[PDB]
Ligand binder design. Structure first.
Ligand SMILES: CCCCCCCCCCCC(=O)SCCNC(=O)CCNC(=O)[C@H](O)C(C)(C)COP(=O)(O)OP(=O)(O)OC[C@@H]1O[C@@H](n2cnc3c(N)ncnc32)[C@H](O)[C@@H]1OP(=O)(O)O
Ligand SMILES: CCCCCCCCCCCC(=O)SCCNC(=O)CCNC(=O)[C@H](O)C(C)(C)COP(=O)(O)OP(=O)(O)OC[C@H]1O[C@@H](n2cnc3c(N)ncnc32)[C@H](O)[C@@H]1OP(=O)(O)O
Lengths: 334, 334
């Protein structure tokens, strides 16, 4: 008999940079209301959204992901050659196959590197970040790209009074690699598969394919149900993430929850009992909810405005579809 | 400034068990030959396939994954309560969201546990396995389910003379957890994004959705290119996985390549230069190509026939869409 080798990589792993891509076209609340009975004022006070970006027709979750990666690499002072793997997290790659990751890799000039697509609603970034961290620590890679990307706008039913003003397009990537001190806390994650219907595609693609004369699929949302779940449960998730990371709530400088809704997030702020001067991500204002892309996009907004600084202690909480959640403490990149 | 804490999991991780779900309906080559100009003889000698199983209309990738997990749990002497996380790998979950994993978790009676969907063509399993091992060793979980599942049959163009006889339905899961001795070698993985068109959905869902009554999407395949790529490249992949695991080719007792084609796989046998008596998975004979699910399904097939024993040193090689590949040495479960 023989033994399978026991291996390990670098223990200390961190975020080296963030890179954000936001589509050109700006969509105002007045524009969104062109098919629903609503107002700009209502939408804003209910969601915290003022505007959002929609990508062009020639753009995709993969294409925006690539731009986001190019930017993250630039901000890290690295090239494609430095990366060992890419995990794409998204809910809007509109192909059963091929995966987006290998495509992104080839467009970056690193066609050979490992990679896969990971889906878990808005929690995808948290799961993907944790996954890169585990892999790097396990020695399966030294440096990786983790990119959240979303082209949600083609899934929106403009007549849906419950959600048409919520979702938007964009991508953001983080470079993950070895750092002098631990930059990514342990992953806290879970789900509620009993509420799988709360955020969904209503009609599966095959069903749609077989009945073209029926309705087409759209994103459907049980808003209040999600609101209750998130505002009620994400305080404990955050607490477990900070506990695993061995940091107190008073030590958090930056709160970056998934940008689902500003009312939920400000509720989670009070709940987590961060300190008064704690910086709270509000990228939802002109970005809207970009699911898997929301957290890294928000990290980038906090950094480009200087509201957050490199090295700040941050709490990331992703929550959403399937009813999935993932959270971790991290040191801000760049 | 406080340093972020690091959590720790198991050092030795293994496959405790495997469970296989195979759909009731058997589709013979002659049945496939009702819509293409071919013969049973041709298909068999060119692919190694005699028959394949197709799932019922009311079955899905998530539902077969669930049955597969239940059996895997049963074969390990465990219940849902013992599982900390589930990763569903598939290419045929026909919803952008919610993800399959939380749904499967809830059907199993463990609705809270962490989980996500992983897509990487047929290499999904290897990536999913590698990720589960990384998370367990990293201490994000102690015991996990990794389930490969595929309902490919509704994506087949029955008139496509190049592929209609290749893909099939089924699911199989492994229980992954701590073992006395190292049961899972290091992941060796990569891709070839320049050949993303080799195996693909021809029409993306959104384009299709905006012209439903026109042509619908189907799985398309540049077979000779894939054949060439796999037979020429997977020998070195295997060799890297074995070198990583610190094992010699003469020490492998069981070869389990992705069941894409029996001609490719037998070429890889000669290429890797395994010993004469080494057991080679040939589940493809009556299972067909089940992508993400093929390796676990084939593992299960070898064990139920006694051709393989639990504890045998196995080389797993997954290759397919996006042009992705993942390989590792492991000890057989159950
Ligand atoms: C291609 C397919 C692929 C589809 C698949 C695409 C992939 C998707 C991937 C998603 C991945 C994720 O998980 S992303 C993260 C998920 N996050 C979220 O969904 C955000 C969380 N959502 C929320 O918190 C909520 O939606 C709120 C609070 C923002 C929305 O509040 P609300 O639900 O509108 O409030 P409520 O009044 O109770 O709701 C009912 C309605 O609002 C009222 N209303 C609306 N506007 C007005 C108004 N101006 N004046 C008075 N009332 C108004 C209407 O009566 C309307 O009726 P009616 O509505 O009853 O008709
Ligand atoms: C909703 C959408 C989502 C869709 C998305 C669904 C998700 C998919 C997920 C996939 C995930 C994976 O990675 S799965 C792993 C992928 N694996 C594979 O694809 C398996 C590898 N493939 C192969 O080995 C190949 O396909 C072969 C060798 C089986 C096919 O060879 P081939 O068909 O002979 O190729 P070709 O050179 O075109 O043949 C040329 C000529 O040969 C003869 N010929 C060809 N076929 C036949 C025939 N059946 N019977 C008699 N003769 C024939 C003819 O004279 C023909 O005519 P003429 O040309 O002279 O006129």
């Amino acid at each position: 008999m023989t033994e399978i080798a026991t291996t390990s990589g670098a223990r200390s792993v961190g975020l080296l940079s963030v890179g954000a891509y936001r589509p050109e076209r700006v969509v105002t609340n007045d524009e969104i209301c062109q098919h629903i009975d609503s107002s700009d004022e209502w939408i804003y006070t209910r969601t915290g959204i003022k505007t959002r970006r929609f990508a062009a027709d020639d753009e995709s979750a993969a294409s925006m992901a690539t731009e986001a990666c190019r930017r993250a690499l630039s901000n890290a002072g690295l090239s494609a050659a430095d990366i060992d793997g890419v995990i794409v997290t998204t809910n809007t790659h509109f192909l059963q196959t091929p995966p987006a990751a290998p495509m992104v890799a080839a467009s970056l000039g690193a066609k050979g590197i490992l990679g896969f697509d990971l889906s878990a609603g808005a929690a995808g970034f948290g799961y993907a970040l944790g996954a890169a961290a585990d892999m790097i620590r396990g020695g399966g890679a030294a440096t990786m790209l983790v990119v959240g990307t979303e082209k949600l706008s083609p899934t929106i039913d403009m007549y849906d009074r419950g959600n048409c003003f919520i979702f938007a397009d964009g991508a953001a990537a983080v470079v993950v690699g070895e750092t002098p001190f631990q930059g990514i806390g342990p992953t806290v994650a879970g789900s509620d598969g009993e509420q799988a219907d709360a955020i969904r595609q209503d009609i599966d693609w095959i069903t749609f394919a077989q009945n073209p004369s029926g309705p087409r699929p759209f994103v459907r949302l049980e808003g209040p149900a999600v609101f209750r779940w998130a505002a009620f449960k994400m305080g404990d998730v955050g607490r477990r993430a900070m506990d695993a990371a061995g940091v107190r709530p008073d030590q958090i400088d930056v709160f970056v929850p998934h940008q689902a809704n500003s009312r939920i997030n400000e509720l989670l702020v009070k709940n987590l009992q961060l300190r008064p001067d704690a910086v709270v991500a509000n990228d939802i204002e002109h970005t809207g909810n970009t699911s898997a892309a929301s957290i890294p996009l928000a990290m980038a907004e906090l950094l480009t405005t200087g509201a957050a600084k490199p090295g700040d202690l941050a709490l990331l909480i992703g929550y959403g579809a399937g009813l999935s959640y993932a959270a971790q403490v991290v040191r801000m990149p760049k």
